[PDB]
Design a protein around this ligand. Structure first.
Ligand SMILES: [Zn+2]
Ligand SMILES: [Zn+2]
Ligand SMILES: [Zn+2]
Ligand SMILES: [Zn+2]
Lengths: 272, 269
């Protein structure tokens, strides 16, 4: 599964994006739910430091440290620079359990700072944080996963199969293409409807939808519509608004046939 | 449900006992699973301070706070519980007065409010790790008065008092092992409900005697006169052998009700 996660507003939120071995947020229960799968984690990106987005980190590091043996690898954990709650909790984990001190590295990130990923299939993707409006208290980030790609220059897009192949054979691939950065994944974290520009072009939007501050579903769909996003996952949903949102979802699925709309049910583990 | 719990060895363990609004242990996920039921907690008793038994505590008080402080009891000397609760309060000023921790000495009783009856109390026993008994103080007619009729017994009670005609005895309503080896039959004997850890299904691969194997546990259940037992703290390795293994003992011991907490799902009873 490309994505396995769980999200219930105020209680716990965590999203495992398997393709890049990245865990976004770490609410309680992630290690219990994923088991030995936590050994496969290479990165943790935290949107912020509220307990429902970080309390599961201790279990992740504890299980990795006890179950990987001499083949354990340090877990890189990234969070919004200046977020004291993340720093206090990670310091407590290391202080309270010396055996875990070197099991993970905590890296504060500045907005816009890129982190290139190390996985199989090529060196071509990086994670990039953007500031979000949430508690107005501490710093929160949303994240994009970008993929460095190459596409044919406009002038060569009309050539047929044989013509483009002939040209590439003669002049090389780079000559007929230009590089561009595709947003392959966007996670909002807790925040108000993202600016249509922040989400435009993303192949998969994962946006909080706490209400029927945070964001209400209508403001989110409006944003998706303006940015022309085709695939969105709604999360950070509360249990009191289950059916109400569920109904508005089908309503939206009809009103927006070209857009795939999924949601993480606050009562069950999500998989895609 | 008198018991809603979840347990998976090394990952998370929490057992909510609704009759007394008591939560035993608080492994990660308890507030997420129980939701608003956490508002109902009257007490939390921790068997120890390993991450899989306490990481969910922050979540519980955070959700509760969002009304006297919740009382949290744990084994005296357990530094891990102290360090974690101190971190919660130091790092979250708003929760600083939301709960209180209380170290307990082995055998130290905590009488439960009740409706003012104080008929029930919790008592820890060593397994710093503690197991716990919930005791109910009951009364029964002294043997010498069993034959008196209604009028005769009331005349005696009037003249002598209720205490004179009855005798109080302490009944073990619930026993929770916490993490430990098979408990001495003496410790469990008499309990109406035993919830005992069952980390291994085969003692052969227990590099360290800090956990009980099912046969050993069943041995103690045998030696004592234990009615129903809920096996928990079960490891993932023995994920499927579970049924079988348990099916056999349900057979080799047809008088013993054997329930268990599947490491893959929340338990309800
Ligand atoms: Zn949140
Ligand atoms: Zn938040
Ligand atoms: Zn344990
Ligand atoms: Zn333990």
């Amino acid at each position: 599964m490309n994505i396995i996660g769980f999200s219930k507003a105020l209680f716990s939120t965590w999203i495992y994006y398997s393709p890049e071995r990245i865990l976004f947020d770490a609410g309680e229960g992630v290690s219990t739910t994923l088991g030995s799968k936590v050994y496969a984690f290479k990165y943790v990106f935290l949107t912020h430091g509220h307990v429902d987005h970080i309390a599961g980190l201790w279990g992740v590091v504890n299980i990795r440290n006890n179950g990987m043996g001499d083949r354990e690898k340090p877990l890189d954990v990234f969070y919004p620079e200046g977020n004291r709650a993340v720093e206090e909790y990670t310091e407590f984990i290391k202080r309270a359990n010396p055996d875990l001190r070197f099991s993970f590295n905590v890296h504060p990130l500045k907005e816009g700072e890129r982190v290139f990923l190390r996985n199989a299939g090529g060196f071509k993707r990086y994670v990039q944080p953007f500031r979000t409006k949430h508690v107005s208290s501490e710093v929160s980030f949303g994240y994009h996963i970008f993929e460095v790609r190459r596409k044919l220059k406009k002038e060569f897009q009309g050539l047929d199969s044989k013509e483009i192949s002939r040209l590439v054979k003669e002049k090389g691939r780079d000559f007929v293409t230009e590089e561009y950065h595709k947003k392959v994944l966007t996670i909002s974290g807790d925040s108000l409807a993202l600016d249509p520009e922040e989400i435009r072009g993303t192949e998969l939007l994962i946006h909080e939808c706490t209400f029927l501050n945070h964001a209400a579903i209508d403001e989110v769909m409006e944003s998706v519509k303006a940015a022309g996003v085709k695939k969105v996952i709604l999360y950070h949903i509360s249990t009191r608004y289950i059916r109400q949102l569920k109904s508005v979802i089908k309503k939206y699925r009809e009103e927006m046939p070209d857009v795939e709309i999924l949601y993480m049910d606050p009562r069950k583990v999500f998989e895609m």
